[PDB]
Amino acid sequence: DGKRFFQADPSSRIRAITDLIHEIPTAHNLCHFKHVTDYIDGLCEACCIKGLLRLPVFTTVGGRGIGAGINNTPPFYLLWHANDLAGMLAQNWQPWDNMGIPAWLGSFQKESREVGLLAGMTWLPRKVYLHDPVPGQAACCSCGLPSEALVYSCSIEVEPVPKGLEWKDPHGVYTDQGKSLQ
DNA sequence: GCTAAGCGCACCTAATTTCCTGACGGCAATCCT
Ligand SMILES: [Mg+2]
């Protein structure tokens, strides 16, 4: 009962859990997919979390009506790598003077532009509520690890990314004209 | 019943020209709104 992680204002539109993830096929303009079917099998909690982290980074266009993420169409992502998590964090540490207001706080105040890095790296273009049914699953058949009762669907809306916001992702790659490099 | 040796060439020259095309025609869907 309170604030929730990567969740936002009240919702009405309901979409299946298959579209939060991208690697598994979703409800396209078809009926058959790569042997998946919506509202039958769902993802685990870890898969749901790793799909929620895909939202600020790898959200594409939804047919030119649904807007993209904060860093446009998802560009090339480049970073510095090491054999350890300590070297993982240390080699990509370069911070900026203004941090920003990340989305794991509540409803952030828009105020002026030039968010920084911490507000821009965690921008939420979608929402999640999910309606919990009475009990749930018995054996998992979508993730692969046989788990307890899992999710079935969710609820996704969009937020229009405004104009301006002169901002550069630290790991993104941007062309000569400032557009995203694909 | 049916033979056997020896002998078998090389030199000359072998060519010059000029011409050799142009224009036209080259496709679209449908594989995320
Ligand atoms: Mg899984």
Phi, psi of A46 (to 5 degrees): -65, -40
Contact partners, residue A157, CB within 8 Å, separation at least 6: A11, A13, A126, A127
Contact partners, residue A143, CB within 8 Å, separation at least 6: A43, A44, A47, A150
Compute the distance between CA of residue A163 and CA of residue A143 in angstroms, rounded to an integer: 38
CA A144–ligand 1 middle distance (angstroms): 6
The annotated binding site of A is made up of: 47, 140, 143
CA→C1' distance for A110 and B6 (Å): 127
| 3-class SS string, chain A | CCCCCCCCCCCCCCEECCCCCCCCCCCCCCCCCCCCCCCCCCCCHHHHHHHHCCCCCCCCCCCCCCCCECCECCCCECCCCCCCHHHHHHCCCCCCCCCCCCCCCCCCCCCCCCCCCCCCCCCCCCCCCCCCCCCCCCCCCCCCCCCCCCCCEECCCCCCCCCCCCCCCCCECECCCCCECC
Which tokens in the block code for residue A43? 């993802």
* Angle made by CA atoms A106, A66, A182, in degrees to the nearest 5: 95
Compute the distance between CA of residue A129 and CA of residue A38 in angstroms, rounded to an integer: 17
Compute the distance between CA of residue A158 and CA of residue A142 in angstroms, rounded to an integer: 26
CA→C1' distance for A47 and B13 (Å): 98
Contact partners, residue A4, CB within 8 Å, separation at least 6: none
Nucleotide nearest to A25 (CA to C1'): B32
CA→C1' distance for A69 and B12 (Å): 97
Nucleotide nearest to A19 (CA to C1'): B32
- Cβ of residue A136 lies below 7 Å from strand B: no
Contact partners, residue A77, CB within 8 Å, separation at least 6: A57, A171, A172, A173
Nearest CA among A52, A40, A45, A181 for reference residue A123: A52
Compute the distance between CA of residue A111 and CA of residue A108 in angstroms, rounded to an integer: 9
Which tokens in the block code for residue A15? 């979409």
Please, what's the b/e burial string for A21-57 (b: 16 or more CB within 10 A of its CB; e: otherwise)?
Answer: beebbbeeeeeeeeeeebeebbbbeebbeebbebbbb
Residue position matching structure tokens 């307890």: A148
Q: List the resolution, Å.
A: 3.0
